[PDB]
Design an enzyme around this catalytic site. Structure first.
Site, mmCIF file in Angstrom:
data_model
loop_
_atom_site.group_PDB
_atom_site.id
_atom_site.type_symbol
_atom_site.label_atom_id
_atom_site.label_comp_id
_atom_site.label_asym_id
_atom_site.label_seq_id
_atom_site.Cartn_x
_atom_site.Cartn_y
_atom_site.Cartn_z
ATOM 1 C CG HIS A 68 -90.961 67.749 25.857
ATOM 2 N ND1 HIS A 68 -91.365 66.681 25.124
ATOM 3 C CD2 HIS A 68 -91.637 68.836 25.398
ATOM 4 C CE1 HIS A 68 -92.294 67.093 24.277
ATOM 5 N NE2 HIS A 68 -92.456 68.423 24.396
ATOM 6 C CG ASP A 107 -92.710 71.686 27.418
ATOM 7 O OD1 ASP A 107 -93.794 71.213 27.797
ATOM 8 O OD2 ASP A 107 -92.360 71.732 26.225
ATOM 9 C CD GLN A 269 -91.912 65.020 10.893
ATOM 10 O OE1 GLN A 269 -91.595 66.204 10.908
ATOM 11 N NE2 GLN A 269 -92.516 64.416 11.908
HETATM 12 C C1 LIG Z 1 -100.537 66.524 16.535
HETATM 13 N N1 LIG Z 1 -99.797 65.684 15.583
HETATM 14 C C2 LIG Z 1 -98.370 65.565 15.649
HETATM 15 O O1 LIG Z 1 -97.765 66.190 16.598
HETATM 16 C C3 LIG Z 1 -97.527 64.541 14.857
HETATM 17 C C4 LIG Z 1 -98.224 63.443 14.325
HETATM 18 C C5 LIG Z 1 -97.491 62.446 13.707
HETATM 19 N N2 LIG Z 1 -97.899 61.261 13.080
HETATM 20 C C6 LIG Z 1 -96.684 60.651 12.665
HETATM 21 C C7 LIG Z 1 -96.671 59.362 12.006
HETATM 22 C C8 LIG Z 1 -95.410 58.693 11.977
HETATM 23 C C9 LIG Z 1 -95.294 57.444 11.385
HETATM 24 C C10 LIG Z 1 -96.461 56.898 10.851
HETATM 25 C C11 LIG Z 1 -97.712 57.557 10.903
HETATM 26 C C12 LIG Z 1 -97.866 58.800 11.519
HETATM 27 N N3 LIG Z 1 -95.551 61.349 12.954
HETATM 28 C C13 LIG Z 1 -96.017 62.503 13.635
HETATM 29 C C14 LIG Z 1 -95.292 63.581 14.178
HETATM 30 C C15 LIG Z 1 -96.045 64.610 14.795
HETATM 31 N N4 LIG Z 1 -95.384 65.722 15.375
HETATM 32 C C16 LIG Z 1 -94.080 66.199 15.274
HETATM 33 O O2 LIG Z 1 -93.215 65.754 14.481
HETATM 34 C C17 LIG Z 1 -93.834 67.429 16.176
HETATM 35 N N5 LIG Z 1 -94.628 67.693 17.290
HETATM 36 C C18 LIG Z 1 -94.417 68.828 18.052
HETATM 37 C C19 LIG Z 1 -95.248 69.146 19.274
HETATM 38 C C20 LIG Z 1 -93.384 69.740 17.677
HETATM 39 C C21 LIG Z 1 -92.610 69.479 16.533
HETATM 40 C C22 LIG Z 1 -92.817 68.306 15.750
HETATM 41 C C23 LIG Z 1 -92.020 67.994 14.522
HETATM 42 MG MG LIG Z 2 -95.271 71.069 26.443
HETATM 43 ZN ZN LIG Z 3 -92.670 72.681 24.430
#
Ligand SMILES: CNC(=O)c1cc2[nH]c(-c3ccccc3)nc2cc1NC(=O)c1nc(C)ccc1C
Ligand SMILES: [Mg+2]
Ligand SMILES: [Zn+2]
Length: 313
Positions: A68, A107, A269
């Site tokens: 960030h 941000d 992912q």
């Molecule tokens: C709302 N939900 C999310 O943002 C999310 C949820 C996840 N759950 C797991 C997970 C991992 C290991 C075991 C079980 C679950 N990895 C996750 C990655 C996430 N986000 C991003 O990668 C991500 N978030 C933003 C704001 C911009 C780009 C990316 C690429």
């Molecule tokens: Mg933000």
């Molecule tokens: Zn951002």
């Protein structure tokens, strides 16, 4: 007045594409941003003495966190640049001025922690702003920097133009709160399918500008695979850090943030591309057809994560 910025040829060409990476040279990012304002808005939109001092003040108020950071602000700003340039005539002069500044500021003074972590910590900023906590802070810090002697890049606007641009920037920065994304996309979904979407309805432009901001803020997932993959490390370095701090407050953190569950990452992912990324750029593509390259890139990358699981990398 007569002083363009000019990038090396490869950057001059690649910058116009959605999937452009702004590179590892920190010192060229302000040139890149200024370049995008002149081509996006006009050479005449802002005084260059003043724009430069707003840029370098914003640069300073981003912290040295894994994700960030200042490189995020310019990356997000760039993707809005790509959207604006492929939808030339859909946006007012004011919207093009306000939206690039929104992305660069979206941000500001981020610490690497979620709104959730601020609430469970009982950080003061959680007492001061109950919802969209970091996002109200970021807008706050934006109006601060705008009000330093010599930093008001909008001071040539009329009273009421200025009032509109600060209102565009606020909604834009608030819309980056992913918690409000899901509801916003659904409304836009129904409005486009039932045929009721009206871009001269102001409450409707708002919704669309909200989606654009979400799409730019998630654009990590719309780059070529090796940029997406290496950024994932940065994203996850904050997430696991917040998990570590969750554990110090005696809370088991959600698996997303637990460094013990890196194994489960490729599957997380999948859910993210499926639950958030794909829908976002699908709905964006429907409203703004020229933004299809973002949707294509995002799908290519969903397909790269499916490979990571199937043993194939
Ligand atoms: C709302 N939900 C999310 O943002 C999310 C949820 C996840 N759950 C797991 C997970 C991992 C290991 C075991 C079980 C679950 N990895 C996750 C990655 C996430 N986000 C991003 O990668 C991500 N978030 C933003 C704001 C911009 C780009 C990316 C690429
Ligand atoms: Mg933000
Ligand atoms: Zn951002």
């Amino acid at each position: 007045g007569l002083m363009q910025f000019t990038l090396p040829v490869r950057l001059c060409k690649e910058i116009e594409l959605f999937h452009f990476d702004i590179g590892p040279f920190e010192n060229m990012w302000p040139g890149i941003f200024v370049y995008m304002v002149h081509r996006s808005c006009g050479t005449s939109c802002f005084e260059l003495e003043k724009l430069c001092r707003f840029i370098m003040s914003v640069k300073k108020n981003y912290r040295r966190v894994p994700y960030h950071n200042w490189k995020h602000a310019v990356t997000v700003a760039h993707c809005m640049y790509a959207i604006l340039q492929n939808n030339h005539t859909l946006f007012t002069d004011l919207e093009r001025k306000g939206l690039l500044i929104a992305c660069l500021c979206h941000d500001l003074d981020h610490r690497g922690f979620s709104n959730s972590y601020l609430q469970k910590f009982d950080h003061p900023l959680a007492a001061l702003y109950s919802t969209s906590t970091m996002e109200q802070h970021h807008f706050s810090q934006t109006v601060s920097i705008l009000q330093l002697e010599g930093h008001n890049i909008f001071s040539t606007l009329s009273s009421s133009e200025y009032e509109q641009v600060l209102e565009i920037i606020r909604k834009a920065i608030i819309a980056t709160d992913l918690a409000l994304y899901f509801g916003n996309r659904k409304q836009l979904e129904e409005m486009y399918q039932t045929g009721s979407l009206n871009l001269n309805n102001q409450s409707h432009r708002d919704r669309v500008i909200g989606l654009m901001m979400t799409a730019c803020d998630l654009c990590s997932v719309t780059k070529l695979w090796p940029v997406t993959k290496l950024t994932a490390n940065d994203i996850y370095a904050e997430f696991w850090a917040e998990g570590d701090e969750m554990k110090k407050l005696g809370i088991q953190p959600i698996p997303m943030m637990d460094r013990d569950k890196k194994d489960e990452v490729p599957q997380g992912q999948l859910g993210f591309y499926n639950a958030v990324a794909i829908p976002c750029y699908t709905t964006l593509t429907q409203i703004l057809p020229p933004t299809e390259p973002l949707l294509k890139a995002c799908r290519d990358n969903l397909s790269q994560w499916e490979k990571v699981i199937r043993g194939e990398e």
